[PDB]
């Protein structure tokens with residue numbers, strides 16, 4: 578009943594013991610994160626004299642080979658980030674400790690899902706949203722550098738962490754799934770709530786899919802609730818449809834998974850398959866955001882920066898972020914030139 582000389586468990590994770598000293602450098606504190614890759618522990622670095630976060634990868638090749646890709650991309654971003662300006666988490670260093678690859682990241686604070694849960698999923702200010710929304714568009718602008726051309730492939734509130742708990746400066750984490758621009762190798766990508774139409778429809782994808790995810794996330798930050806909370810892909814696409822309407826024909830004519838959601842009638846047009854949902858395009862984001870009704874649930878009425886003009890700019894930007902066509906969907910650079918930010 579032993580595995581890796583008593584260091585590992587049956588799940589191939591490391592057994593995190595509190596106060597364990599590592600390599601005469603790192604003092605382990607407590608397990609904080611957990612997932613497919615392995616575990617993530619909080620620890621104190623003796624040399625740099627600071628709190629760091631050591632992402633402990635599982636002791637098997639599947640997870641180890643995926644982690645060295647995460648490293649390869651983390652380091653390549655840190656080469657171009659230099660003066661840490663573009664809101665990418667800093668991979669300080671990495672090493673092997675008892676057959677576990679460990680990635681040492683700067684200690685961040687609470688993620689954006691933690692903020693939602695602390696507001697009982699009522700959301701945060703449009704003004705705080707703007708800050709995250711700008712910082713995120715800069716990060717996506719950074720990832721769109723031709724040399725990088727990095728797609729995160731998994732953006733959501735829990736992969737966006739604040740640097741300091743008192744400040745709104747953010748950092749994006751987890752590039753374990755990060756797709757660097759290429760050919761269509763993968764299909765079932767992104768988390769479901771934030772999964773683009775081109776991914777759902779089984780079409781090619783590029784860096785535009787992170788922009789879609791950003792749109793969903795930004796709306797989720799202000800309302801407090803996921804914009805498209807589908808139980809499955811068909812429900813997911815239906816929830817997108819009832820807000821944004823039927824995807825254009827020219828997109829669906831190419832979509833290999835179009836018949837999973839839509840019918841091609843003899844007419845040649847596209848309509849929904851049967852199954853609870855309002856007609857296409859009727860649950861308008863204007864009504865969801867509460868533009869003319871004092872914000873989400875009328876809770877922002879009277880607050881500064883939450884006027885109809887402020888809500889119109891925010892709504893307009895989100896609609897561009899949620900463009901069905903990935904080619905006309907707003908790019909990071911143009912998104913930052915939007916009124917909402919000025």
Ligand SMILES: COc1ccc2sc(NC(C)=O)nc2c1
Pocket residue numbers: 609610612617630632666682683684685686736738750751
């Ligand atoms: C909570 O502090 C951190 C800092 C960097 C990373 S990187 C990482 N990896 C994940 C969340 O999959 N988690 C953290 C957590």
